[PDB]
Amino acid sequence: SANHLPFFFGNITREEAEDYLVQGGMSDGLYLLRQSRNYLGGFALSVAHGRKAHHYTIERELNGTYAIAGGRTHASPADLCHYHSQESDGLVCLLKKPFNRPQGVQPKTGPFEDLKENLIREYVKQTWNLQGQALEQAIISQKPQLEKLIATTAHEKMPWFHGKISREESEQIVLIGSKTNGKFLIRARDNNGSYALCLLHEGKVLHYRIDKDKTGKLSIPEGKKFDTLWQLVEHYSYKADGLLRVLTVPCQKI
Amino acid sequence: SANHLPFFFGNITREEAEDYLVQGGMSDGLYLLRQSRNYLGGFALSVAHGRKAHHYTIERELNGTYAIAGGRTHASPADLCHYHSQESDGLVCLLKKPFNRPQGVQPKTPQLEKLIATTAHEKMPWFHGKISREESEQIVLIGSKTNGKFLIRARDNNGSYALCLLHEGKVLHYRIDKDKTGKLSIPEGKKFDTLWQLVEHYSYKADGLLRVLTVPCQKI
């Protein structure tokens, strides 16, 4: 939980960051650390080199260690920063100055980092039927792993996710009601393997295929790659990044 | 004034309706009553069946009685339903559960009605008496060029009016006509008994127009 690092901006957009750096000075070696949005618990390191910006994904190593694939694995991101602060090591450049969270600004919280923290507290009281003070423990105790669970399967509860469904059973359910554009939903075209994305575009229903690659990473063919969909969505519902448009509203389930 | 009926929502749209249904269970036999928007003082019935939605238009018989075209005529909309709740009668299904006016929600907003309506536009900002197809271009291009600005002027075949609106600096004319039934509708498009209703519709969904109606061109 990198929140102590003054150059850490919770869930921020790649662009949102790119701004901060100019707002920063785009001075070579300027960097800031932001939480990743398509890799569980990993991060992203953004740095200014030559009026251009370079984005690096610090993935989380099963060992509890973090490392941008290809390089050494460090204790914590701060270390990794401290480290790259004196050794290029594959990096476009050294990290001279860090861009600190401007006066007042706080780290961005996703729209579920908030949900989750409770989502499970729930799961727990439920499956484990305990409460009072018993509950408090279980979570802090168990927490560490639970996250990886609730996550990969939270979409199961999300409005845009409509269980297992026919290609048409979809067409229809989305055409029904308000034909506001960018209305979407995801249906599994197979239990856990791969799913599918449907959205409304100029009264037209659009189906984009989604699949889990070798790595257990979902990604529209030729598209960004996410751990979870909760992530996937949250992203495309922000920038088309390929789609004929962006997602808006979660078609309603019957 | 079926206002008393708890499963009645004033001027709601087909769509606004179909939502309430699913947000209601979309359970077969689920239904709700709302006002029709193209047929004077009539109503519309929407019922959930086969996960899909079914819209029925309840027309008002001159007798002051109402009846979905082709079937028995009932005293008031309330009865019609009480009756179709025990009887399919052509109705794709039985009317088991009604959908009540959600907590808090209100309804959206015999012959008179039929009068003031066909002729209400007469007094409406968007309606510009009788005028050349040009006097309009002008009057319309004058002032704020906000897109979607519109107005209706009657041609000369007194039962024949026209539609004028702004689209990307260009003025568009859409022909309107009163068919044999005395019902107005753009060639190939939806039909209404009046305009204050034709408009109220198209100033909601293109439904075929290059864009949706917005602001009523000011009249001199």
Binding site: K179, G203 | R14, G70, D89, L209
Partner: peptide
């Protein structure tokens, strides 16, 4: 001299009895 034509695609249909 020219009137604008319509766009089918956005057309709501009504259910009948039987």
């Amino acid at each position: 001299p020219d009137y604008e034509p319509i766009r089918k695609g956005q057309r709501d249909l009504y259910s009948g009895l039987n």
